[PDB]
Amino acid sequence: QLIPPLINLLMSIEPDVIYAGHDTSSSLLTSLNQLGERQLLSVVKWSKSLPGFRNLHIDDQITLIQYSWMSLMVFGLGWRSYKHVSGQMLYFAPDLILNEQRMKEFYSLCLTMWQIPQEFVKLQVSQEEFLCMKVLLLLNTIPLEGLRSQTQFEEMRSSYIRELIKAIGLRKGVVSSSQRFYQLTKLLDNLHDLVKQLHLYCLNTFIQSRALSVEFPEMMSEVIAAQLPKILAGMVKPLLFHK
Ligand SMILES: Cc1ccccc1CN(c1ccc(C#N)c(Cl)c1)[C@H]1CCN(S(C)(=O)=O)C1
């Protein structure tokens, strides 16, 4: 068993393929919102089997899923684009793949999201590294006052940091593996800035949804309404690997 047990578990609990259910701006945005609803459901289900997560206070579980909703979607988009289209298209779902031609306005945000699959291609991120990084992304922001289950949270983060180091070790050399840890963790740090612009665009679109004729499903609407205003206002503590 060359592949470490926890990485193998993460492989098995990965979501199955998620379809958007999918051509104008409002219809494209509505289809992306419909995908976002299904992605949110899949993340909550995933979190139920994620080792360590269910042992956190339920308030912290909800908070962490809501905080990391956008980040986990765009990180998953990065993987699928990388895997299916060599990072040269945005593979939101099998029934929703976007190239330049299908971006007209929104295009600017698509270009910034596009930076992630490009870094995956550049770094040649392995599935084992991706799966550990994904868990760290879920645990990458906390409230200003911390979590109720802070001690449990810290231990879990450390466990998946240690697992990421194992993941890197699968493919030699103390200097190189140390350099690769910096690169992958700096990628995660850099996502905070990218997701800020995605959060802002989302909240703006949510506010103007009636005028734009864009439907926002109920579960993802609650995340947007409940959390994005205070996240954008800076009422959370982003965690960073590098100061
Ligand atoms: C913020 C943004 C920008 C471009 C394309 C998509 C998004 C975000 N979305 C999104 C949906 C699914 C996935 C996946 N997988 C991703 Cl990464 C983003 C959804 C959720 C909110 N919007 S919006 C602009 O109407 O508020 C569409």
Give yes or no for residue 214 CB within 6 A of ligand 1: yes
CA–CA–CA angle 64, 128, 97 (5° rounding): 75
For the Cβ of 98 lying below 6 angstroms from any atom of ligand 1, the answer is no
User: Phi/psi of residue 233, each to 5°?
Assistant: -70, -10
Going by C-beta distance under 8 Å and a sequence separation of 6 or more, which residues neighbour residue 25?
104, 105, 106, 212
Q: Is 110 in the pocket of ligand 1 (CB under 6 A)?
A: yes
Q: What amino acid occupies position 128?
A: E
Query: Which residues, 6 or more positions from 241, have their beta carbon under 8 angstroms from its beta carbon?
Result: 185, 186, 188, 189
For ligand 1, atom 9, the nearest C-alpha belongs to: 32
Structure tokens at 142: 């906390």
Cα separation, 186 vs 88, in Å, equals 22
Q: Name the residue ranges covered by the structural domains of the chain.
A: 1-243
Gap from CA of 210 to ligand 1 centroid (Å)? 17
Is 180 labeled as ligand-binding? no
201 lines ligand 1 (CB under 6 A): yes
Start-to-end CA distance of the chain, whole Å, equals 36
CB 89 within 8 A of CB 98: yes
Instruction: Compute the distance between CA of residue 229 and CA of residue 242 in angstroms, rounded to an integer.
Output: 26
96 lines ligand 1 (CB under 6 A): no
Amino acid symbol at 13 = I
Pairing outcome for strands 96-98 and 90-93: antiparallel
Q: φ and ψ at 237, to 5 degrees?
A: -115, 100
* CA distances (Å), origin 67, targets 137, 170, 182, 235: 10, 31, 24, 11
Resolution of the coordinates, Å: 2.0
Instruction: Tell me the C-alpha distance between 231 and 143, whole Å.
Output: 9
Atom of ligand 1 nearest to the CA of 214: 25
Minimal-distance CA residue to ligand 1 atom 17: 74
CATH of domain 1-243: 1.10.565.10
Distance CA 36, CA 38 (A): 5
Burial of 71 (0-12, 13-18, 19+ CB in 10 A): buried
Name every residue whose Cβ is closer than 8 Å to that of residue 223 and which is 6 or more positions away in sequence: 40, 66, 69
